[PDB]
Amino acid sequence: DPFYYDYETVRNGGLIFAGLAFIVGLLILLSRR
Amino acid sequence: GSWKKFIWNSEKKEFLGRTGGSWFKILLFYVIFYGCLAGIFIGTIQVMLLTISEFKPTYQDRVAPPGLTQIPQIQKTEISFRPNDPKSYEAYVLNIVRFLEKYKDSAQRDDMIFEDCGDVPSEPKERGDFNHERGERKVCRFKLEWLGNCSGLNDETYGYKEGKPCIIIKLNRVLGFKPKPPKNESLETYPVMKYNPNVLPVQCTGKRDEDKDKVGNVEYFGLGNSPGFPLQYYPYYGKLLQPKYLQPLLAVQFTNLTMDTEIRIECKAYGENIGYSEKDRFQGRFDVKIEVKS
Amino acid sequence: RDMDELKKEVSMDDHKLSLDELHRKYGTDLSRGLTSARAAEILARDGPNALTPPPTTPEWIKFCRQLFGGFSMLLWIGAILCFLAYSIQAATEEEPQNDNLYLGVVLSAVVIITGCFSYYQEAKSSKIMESFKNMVPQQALVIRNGEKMSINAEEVVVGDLVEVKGGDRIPADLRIISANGCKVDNSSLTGESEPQTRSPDFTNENPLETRNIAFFSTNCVEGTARGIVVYTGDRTVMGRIATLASGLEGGQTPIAAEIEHFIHIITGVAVFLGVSFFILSLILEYTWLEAVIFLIGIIVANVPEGLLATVTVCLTLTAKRMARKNCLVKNLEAVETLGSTSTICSDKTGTLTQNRMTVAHMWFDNQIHEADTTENQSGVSFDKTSATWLALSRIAGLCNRAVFQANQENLPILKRAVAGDASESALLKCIELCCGSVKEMRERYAKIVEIPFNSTNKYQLSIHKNPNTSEPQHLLVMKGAPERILDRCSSILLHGKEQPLDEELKDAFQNAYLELGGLGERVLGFCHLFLPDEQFPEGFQFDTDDVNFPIDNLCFVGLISMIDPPRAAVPDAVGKCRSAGIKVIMVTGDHPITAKAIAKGVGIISEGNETVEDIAARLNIPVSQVNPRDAKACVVHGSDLKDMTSEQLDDILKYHTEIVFARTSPQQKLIIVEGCQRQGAIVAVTGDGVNDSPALKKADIGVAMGIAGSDVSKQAADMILLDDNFASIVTGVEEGRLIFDNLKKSIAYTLTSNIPEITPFLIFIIANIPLPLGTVTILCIDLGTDMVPAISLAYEQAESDIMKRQPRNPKTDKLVNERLISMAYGQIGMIQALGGFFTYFVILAENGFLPIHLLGLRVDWDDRWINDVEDSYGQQWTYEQRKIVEFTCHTAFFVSIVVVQWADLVICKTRRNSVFQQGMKNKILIFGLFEETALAAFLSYCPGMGVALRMYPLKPTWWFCAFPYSLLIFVYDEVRKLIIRRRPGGWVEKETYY
Ligand SMILES: CCCCCCCCCCCCCCCCCC(=O)OC[C@H](COP(=O)([O-])OCC[N+](C)(C)C)OC(=O)CCCCCCCCCCCCCCCCC
Ligand SMILES: CC(C)CCC[C@H](C)[C@H]1CC[C@H]2[C@H]3CC=C4C[C@@H](OC(=O)CCC(=O)O)CC[C@@]4(C)[C@@H]3CC[C@@]12C
Ligand SMILES: CC(C)CCC[C@H](C)[C@H]1CC[C@H]2[C@H]3CC=C4C[C@@H](OC(=O)CCC(=O)O)CC[C@@]4(C)[C@@H]3CC[C@@]12C
Ligand SMILES: CC(C)CCC[C@H](C)[C@H]1CC[C@H]2[C@H]3CC=C4C[C@@H](OC(=O)CCC(=O)O)CC[C@@]4(C)[C@@H]3CC[C@@]12C
Ligand SMILES: CC(C)CCC[C@H](C)[C@H]1CC[C@H]2[C@H]3CC=C4C[C@@H](OC(=O)CCC(=O)O)CC[C@@]4(C)[C@@H]3CC[C@@]12C
Ligand SMILES: CC(C)CCC[C@H](C)[C@H]1CC[C@H]2[C@H]3CC=C4C[C@@H](OC(=O)CCC(=O)O)CC[C@]4(C)[C@@H]3CC[C@@]12C
Ligand SMILES: CC(C)CCC[C@H](C)[C@H]1CC[C@H]2[C@H]3CC=C4C[C@@H](OC(=O)CCC(=O)O)CC[C@]4(C)[C@@H]3CC[C@@]12C
Ligand SMILES: *[C@@H]1O[C@H](CO)[C@@H](O[C@@H]2O[C@H](CO)[C@@H](O)[C@H](O)[C@H]2NC(C)=O)[C@H](O)[C@H]1NC(C)=O
Ligand SMILES: *[C@@H]1O[C@H](CO)[C@@H](O)[C@H](O)[C@H]1NC(C)=O
Ligand SMILES: [K+]
Ligand SMILES: [K+]
Ligand SMILES: [K+]
Ligand SMILES: [Mg+2]
Secondary structure, eight states: OOOOHHHHHHHHHHHHHHHHHHHHHHHSSSOOO | TTTTTOOOOOOTOOTTTHHHHHHHHHHHHHHHHHHHHHHHHHHHHHHHTTTTTTSSSSSGGGGGGGGGGEEOOOOEEEEEEEETTTTHHHHHHHHHHHHTTTTTTGGSOOOSSOOOOOOOOOOOOOOSSSTTTTTTTEEEOGGGGGGGTTSSSSOTTTTTTGGHHHHHHHHOOOOOOOOOOOOOSSSSSSOOOOTTTTTTEEEEEEEESSTTSSSSSEEEESSSSEEEEEEEEOOOTTTOOOTTOOOEEEEEEEEEOOOSSEEEEEEEESSSOOOOOSOTTBBSSEEEEEEOOO | HHHHSSSSSSOHHHHHHHHHHHHHHHBBBBTTBOOOOHHHHHHHHHOSSSSOOOOOOOHHHHHTTTSSSSHHHHHHHHHHEEEHHHHHHHHTTOOOOOOOHHHHHHHHHHHHHHHHHHHHTSSOOOOSSSHTSSSSOBBBEEEEEEEEEBGGGOOOTTTTTTEETTTTOOOOOEEEEEEEEEEEOOHHHOOOOOOOOOSOOOOSSSSSSOOOOOOOOOOSSSSEEEEEEEEEESSHHHHHHHHHHSSSEEEEEHHHHHHHHHHHHHHHHHHHHHHTTHHHHHHOOHHHHHHHHHHHHHHHTTTTTTTTHHHHHHHHHHHHHHHHHTTEETTTHHHHHSSOOOEEEEEEIIIIIISOEEEEETTSSSOOOOOOHHHOOSSSSOOSSSSHHHHHHHHHHHOOOOBSSSSTTSGGGGGGGSSHHHHHHHHHHHHHHHHSOSHHHHHHHHHEEOOOOOOHHHHHHHEEESSTTOOOSSSEEEEEEEHTTTTOOOEETTTTEOOOOOHHHHHHHHHHHHHTTTTOOOEEEEEEEEOOOOSOOOTTOOOOSOOSSOOOOOOOOOOOEEEEBOOSSSSHHHHHHHTTEEEEEESSSSSSHOOOOOOOOTSSSSSSSSOOOHHHHHHHHHHSSSSSSSSSEEETHHHHHHHHOOHHHHHHHHHHSSSEEOOOOOOHHHHHHHHHHHOOOOOOEOOSGGGGHHHHHHHSSEEEEEEEEEEETTSSSSEEEOOOOTTHHHHHHHHHHHHHHHHHHHHHHHHTTTTHHHHHHHHHHSSSSOOOOSSSSHIIIIIIIIIHHHHHHGGGOOOOOOOGGGGSSSSOOOOOOOOHHHHIIIIIIHHHHHHHHHHHHHHHHHHOOTTTTTOOOOOHHHHTTTOOOOTTTOOOHHHHHHHHHHHHHHHHHHHHHHHHHHHHHHHTSSSSHHHHHOOOOOHHHHHHHHHHHHHHHHHHHHOOOOOHTTTOOOOOOGGTTTTTHHHHHHHHHHHHHHHHHHHHSSSHHHHHHH
């Protein structure tokens, strides 16, 4: 089906990335205290 | 001051704080820098264009159900004219005349390009694959005589002089798209019309309940007996493999409108492939407002 | 005009008068005072005895003045044009389209919020006159109708008779006529706590130095006095000081002059781009709605919307960093000012000194011992082993009338209050810290007969019982002024032995005395005698009016010397300030001998460099026969400032490098600060007392001392040193120079991204192409993803050692110059714009619009009623089908700008050094790097964002379209810094270094 694109897969992958990158950046910021 | 000190202090020969060579060197730097940036931009554009196939676009999900349009290109879906006034309907008739130029039989008489297709609506025509593996393809030809009482081989105003106006409905071209008419359960679509397995059906009704009793009689003209698009024409292959492609049309005439009232009319196609939208008021469907002043 | 009149000396000619002229100039009969028929009439004639605060502007005027600050004007214009577009839109045909209403509301809220940010930065109008209104008493003590009564101090008139006792505050200025020696404390005028004996006789032409004028806001602390009022309220000397210090304007901070220079530059470029491309949209015949939408889009793209809030937050972080080093910063803009300062005009007593007289040196046994004059005992001691040390410990501990207070023993020795005088408590604290308690010795040596210091005999003496095995049975001990003490002595004490008197020791004694007096220090000598038992039995008593004990005590114990010593940190801090290029000037109310000795001790006057008088004494020449340009140090008495012209002061400040002013008035420090400021300087002023409060108000930054400081100076200051650590000043210089270098980088980071925001709108009107970027997604760039990476640059460290540089010029050496503009707009911004245009062309080519086909497609694409637009493959598009592709291009342009700002953040950390030499040891930078991309991916992929912001999901391979342009930015700036480092004065450093 060339007239269909699955946007929910890309949406879920982007939201998983957006959660993981934020938790990783906050762990980098709050290293010790 | 701002008169003689900052602009043209001439004891060190400076215009706005720079000498002549200090202007030349920075201008040479900037023309060289912008030349190198233009070179990098053109090179990256060419490497991107090497990934593009010239027979089929990369993505087709944003035109995925096509749109339905009507040929007198009007400005706010309004049609307003006085039939005893040949200046009010001039732009409408001129636009209809400029559209149906390439549908005259004096324009489809090549035989290496055009071909006499059927006279009954039929199955879609698959002409191979999208890869020039067979060069230019041929096009089924569309007779203007099938638009009868809305062609030009009669009165030359397409009905606008005698009250009853007429519009020409077409579907938006999508490459490789084959419309699927609704399957028989004898129920599915709405409400009832003459079912053909090779016609995409199209109906034009009144929008509100107060317009259903005022639109009067509606006449359809096209190929065949059941009102819609015949499926012979439909695997379109692009303007590289098929220039001079003629899409099928459907003429609709409103013969018994009521006068001095803006009437709202919705036209709509039905299929397994045809989708609708509340944000896009032209997808598989369109609306028009017709007022005949007298 | 009038406060220009307030900067003059006070004129009296009352102290030059006698008891007859006062009887008719004020009408007061000097024994009975005034009747209330005259006093209540003169009160209505002249004015009450009070001060009055100045007119203060309220808080809402000072807040609503912040709503027109340069960038706010262009944004108010944008918010007005948004409502104009909405009203021309939805009141002709289209009942949808509430898009241009919310945009105006957002632009109206952005102005209010950034006005709140710039209001917090404002310079905090404080209350000096309210602390001047607390040194006035509530009750006076007047003599009216032949008797005495205590009235309110606000109801004193010019002419009546006041009686002051020890403990009072003084209600007005008094010309005094009868006093049995009361001592006032004139620390409000001279900054000195040493009391002055007031007397009814004329002593000096200058009225600030005479004995018969008591002053307002001071306190007579002994005896009693009767005086006649000469001034009340605003006309007194300290009232005029209060009027001057509350009438002195603020002045513009140097950091504010840097903000109000690039506001000008950026507004000029924005106004030029806005009014030159709006008339092109009228030449080419747009409609008015499209012309104002284009104007809105070009205004929002030009203003760096979140920049002033970034500067406010960076200054707040630096001020909170300075507050953990006990350095409280009241006005925020004074964080920067200590870095760009070029002249420090310091005060001596209380600021450089410890304001406590203590023992400096001794002269035991024909040798000079130095003590440790430090408040935390950082130095080393002198001697505790010899016999004469224990002897003089006994002597200085027993001939002492001072005593401790009521049991504050938990607080340590050097800060316990005493009850006696300071000159004897200096002995008492040295004896107490170096030989245990003194009360044990004072009880075991019982006192039999004493007489304290008589002012015409120059010593103080006592007789004490010795209770131990030596037993002279009532030994003798005295102390006094050194030459009159060795007038009458012939036996010397050497390591506990007796030797006779030869001049072998006596010219050494006068050698030690001359060398000690050359240190500006107060020296006195001590004596004792082991009395025999031929005339002096046990139980015998001596009387204090005759001679029956020997006053020929052949004693010689030693000399002890006193000084107000420098603090622990000042000699290193003055050298650190001089090595950074700052000129340190001493300004004080003390006498020039102690002033010059302290200025040589702390290091303001260096070694080898000596004055004019040292030349004329070294060469035995009259001082008018030596060129004044020979010496490079000067000590200017304050009485010679009075007859000085404003351009001779410029000569003094111009030709010398080590300047000391002494006997300075409170008004004359203001003259000195303005004289340094006049020849283009940034002047810091450090102070502790009320007599520095005008000079703290005129200066670019005023630093007050926290513990030992007056309440008046803590209201007139911009900084408070909360632990009296003067070496924090040097630290305040260092982080002053660092934040000025960290601001540039952040400003450069916020200017570069302006360029892939302006050029979408220009190519829209030049090339007639579908619009690559919207206004909402421009606001999401700066108000969103740019705040944290710009704020993170304020944590960068120094690249070089910044205390080796000279101070920055104010006239040249701007914050934003032509080279930062050239680098941000002309070089990195163009690569950032090409990176976004490439991503724009990719998506349209992948949906079927080839780049040659997009030229001139603007009118048909924007047309709401053309619902068949042919692409490059022949497909026809409805209007809402291609607008989705356009908003996908808007989202991807936003993502591309986010991707190129990674490399822009990495190249903006350093200006000369590399990223491989400095490192990536900044954690908030990496947090900003992560959270910017997290916010972009959240905005792109969240459900419902296509309605609220018109943002659409991106396909996964469209995230990588701007990676080669970031790589180009990175390698280009690395190569540029390499050419800067290897050719240290060439063309690339002259063009691209900020
Ligand atoms: C992926 C690519 C990464 C690397 C690309 C970056 C290459 C360029 C380095 C970046 C900064 C620009 C430096 C190039 C010019 C330096 C010339 C020089 O050495 O100065 C010394 C020379 C010699 O002077 P000088 O150094 O000796 O200075 C004079 C003072 N004394 C004598 C004391 C040193 O400068 C000149 O005399 C005139 C220089 C002006 C030349 C006119 C413009 C030249 C065009 C070059 C543009 C290159 C940019 C290309 C764009 C790249 C696309 C990203
Ligand atoms: C190269 C250096 C500079 C580090 C790159 C940092 C970027 C944030 C990287 C991290 C992972 C990359 C991407 C990896 C794959 C996902 C696909 C997408 O989610 C999905 O499509 C999942 C569904 C599927 O893949 O089947 C969300 C964004 C994206 C492009 C990521 C966005 C961020 C990218 C470009
Ligand atoms: C810092 C600012 C001023 C730079 C941004 C301006 C852009 C570089 C402009 C210049 C003209 C625009 C475009 C106009 C159309 C051309 C067609 C293209 O050439 C082709 O058509 C290739 C067709 C072929 O292969 O024959 C070269 C780049 C491109 C997309 C241009 C890309 C860059 C645009 C957006
Ligand atoms: C879209 C992509 C292609 C561009 C992203 C650019 C990155 C910012 C690049 C620029 C240079 C790269 C790195 C090259 C090596 C250095 C070593 C490192 O140095 C140290 O910390 C060592 C300790 C010290 O030297 O003091 C500093 C960061 C780092 C990783 C750099 C961090 C940033 C990298 C990954
Ligand atoms: C001279 C320097 C600045 C760039 C040259 C090296 C780059 C690594 C080249 C190699 C191929 C180029 C591009 C070719 C394809 C594009 C679009 C996109 O990939 C596709 O083209 C897929 C589209 C399709 O499948 O039809 C994302 C990667 C990107 C930006 C590539 C990024 C890297 C480019 C510019
Ligand atoms: C320093 C940088 C920021 C400015 C230089 C970048 C320019 C925008 C580059 C990008 C692509 C270049 C050109 C490449 C060739 C085309 C063909 C030219 O004529 C045509 O339209 C094709 C002939 C036709 O079909 O009519 C239109 C503009 C033009 C796009 C481009 C105009 C802009 C150029 C000079
Ligand atoms: C592309 C749009 C979004 C505007 C951004 C383009 C840049 C602002 C252009 C405009 C003209 C260029 C430069 C043309 C030559 C001058 C010389 C020079 O100016 C001076 O230093 C002379 C005055 C002095 O030295 O006192 C540095 C800035 C500079 C203005 C310009 C800086 C800005 C450039 C790169
Ligand atoms: C198309 O138009 C023609 C007009 O020429 C219509 O033909 C007329 O129809 C009426 C009603 O049936 C007859 O009375 C006339 O005799 C017809 N004239 C001719 C010349 O045939 C025709 O009906 C129209 N077609 C429709 C409405 O389907
Ligand atoms: C219009 O004319 C047709 C002719 O048969 C008739 O059936 C219909 O009722 C008419 N409509 C109106 C609204 O008069
Ligand atoms: K902006
Ligand atoms: K100040
Ligand atoms: K910006
Ligand atoms: Mg002081």
